[PDB]
């Protein structure tokens, strides 16, 4: 039930999923996520940090159905994980509206907004169901813990 331990699991999951990434550390995801959360706090977009156990579980749900095994670079993985994160902020965030500079790691901004609309068309039903159905939250919560 610890945030850092659940972040670690997600990072270990992402490493397992993306076999092609030979020089990816399970700390790189954790670093990227904590960098965004810190950046928004110290710029005054939020009072508290977003990354809590339930939100990391929410993020994992998105990640496991969006992040393809065939991710061809660590850079492309960051671009996707952060697209999944941005949507977690937008859907579960307390503050009404979050910027996209901290989340954007591609030159081509058009490419990012296209990924958002894909991830939404795919997950919007599950994004609501994980809230609506407590059994499904627990299933995802367990699955995340079983990724270390």
């Amino acid at each position: 039930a610890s945030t850092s331990e659940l972040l670690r699991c997600l990072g270990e999951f992402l490493c397992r999923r993306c076999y092609r990434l030979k020089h990816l550390s399970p700390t790189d995801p954790v670093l990227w996520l904590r960098s965004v959360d810190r950046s928004l706090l110290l710029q005054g977009w939020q009072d508290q940090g977003f990354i809590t156990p339930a939100n990391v579980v929410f993020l994992y749900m998105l990640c496991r159905d969006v992040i393809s095994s065939e991710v061809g670079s660590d850079h492309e993985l960051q671009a996707v994980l952060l697209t999944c994160l941005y949507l977690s902020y937008s859907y579960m965030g307390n503050e009404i509206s979050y910027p996209l500079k901290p989340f954007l790691v591609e030159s081509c901004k058009e490419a990012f907004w296209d990924r958002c609309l894909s991830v939404i068309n795919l997950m919007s039903s599950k994004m609501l169901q994980i809230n609506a159905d407590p059994h499904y939250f627990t299933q995802v919560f367990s699955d995340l813990k079983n990724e270390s």
Binding site: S97, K101, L128, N131
Partner: protein, 290 residues
């Protein structure tokens, strides 16, 4: 590009709204344009949430998102077109509605809201501007920019939700957590506008002034009515106002049945507030009412 703009409907801070025509199938729709390179960022976040929720909220009393388009550093939501909102409709009809219309509008509002709650969604921004009306007399709730899914355990939601005039007393006292009851208060406030001159029941200047106008009419809750109240984060002593103050002059279009429903929506203690489902089974919506 695929659509032909006719006239602007509204100019929000979250986007620009146009009345438009599908060039292919010649149908009239509403268009919300959202710019996607703002030095003062953030606006898109609201649009993405609104989309994610409306994709899973399909109902005749909830505005329909048909499609979303991404072009030329702009995002475009495509809603069904509605003839006006309730705010413009009051100014149009002198603030005066036939009692049978008040029933129609509230019934449809509760059906839409009932669906939202059952699908585990809080609206959190009820107000006439966000109630869309068509000439045929249909009502549809809109604007899910501040709406939210609920069920996952959290530390707290936001207390900075709902326009001050439709915010329930628990949230005005800074309540960390709130259920579906948040929307049922706003719905009560809206009912009172339909039932009089279309004027806000509780039009306060700030939080303090708001809470004084709610207690002045309904009465300051006792420890018995609402034991949780004094434990709330931004609680402070308010005068005991009597529960003897009559609503007859406040909602003069409603008879006893109507006035009863209004009081079950406007329970200060959130746990006591009637639910959308319960309210649709109230005698006020029976086919047996004078």
């Amino acid at each position: 590009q695929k659509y032909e703009k006719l006239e602007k409907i509204g100019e929000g801070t979250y986007g620009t709204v146009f009345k438009a025509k599908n060039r292919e199938t010649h149908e009239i729709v509403a268009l919300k344009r959202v710019r996607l390179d703002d030095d003062d960022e953030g606006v898109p976040s609201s649009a993405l949430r609104e989309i994610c929720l409306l994709k899973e909220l399909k109902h005749k009393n909830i505005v329909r998102l048909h499609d979303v388009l991404h072009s030329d550093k702009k995002l475009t939501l495509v809603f069904e077109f509605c003839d006006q909102d309730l705010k413009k409709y009051f100014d149009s009809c002198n603030g005066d509605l036939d009692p049978e219309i008040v029933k129609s509008f509230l019934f449809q509002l509760l059906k839409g809201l009932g669906f939202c709650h059952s699908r585990n969604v809080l609206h959190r921004d009820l107000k006439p501007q966000n109630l869309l009306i068509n000439r045929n007399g249909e009502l549809k709730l809109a604007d899910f920019g501040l709406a939210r899914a609920f069920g996952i355990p959290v530390r707290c939601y936001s207390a900075e939700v709902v326009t001050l005039w439709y915010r329930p007393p628990d949230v005005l006292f800074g309540a960390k957590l709130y259920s579906t009851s948040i929307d049922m208060w706003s719905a009560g406030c809206i009912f009172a506008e339909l039932a009089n001159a279309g004027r806000p029941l509780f039009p306060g200047n700030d939080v303090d002034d708001q809470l004084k106008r709610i207690f002045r009419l309904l009465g300051t809750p006792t420890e018995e009515q609402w034991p949780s109240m004094t434990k709330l984060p931004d609680y402070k002593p308010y005068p005991m106002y009597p529960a003897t103050t009559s609503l007859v002059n406040v909602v003069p279009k409603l008879n006893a049945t109507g006035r009863d429903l209004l009081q079950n929506l406007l329970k200060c203690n959130p746990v006591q507030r009637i639910s959308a489902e319960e309210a649709l089974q109230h005698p006020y919506f029976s086919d047996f009412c004078p």
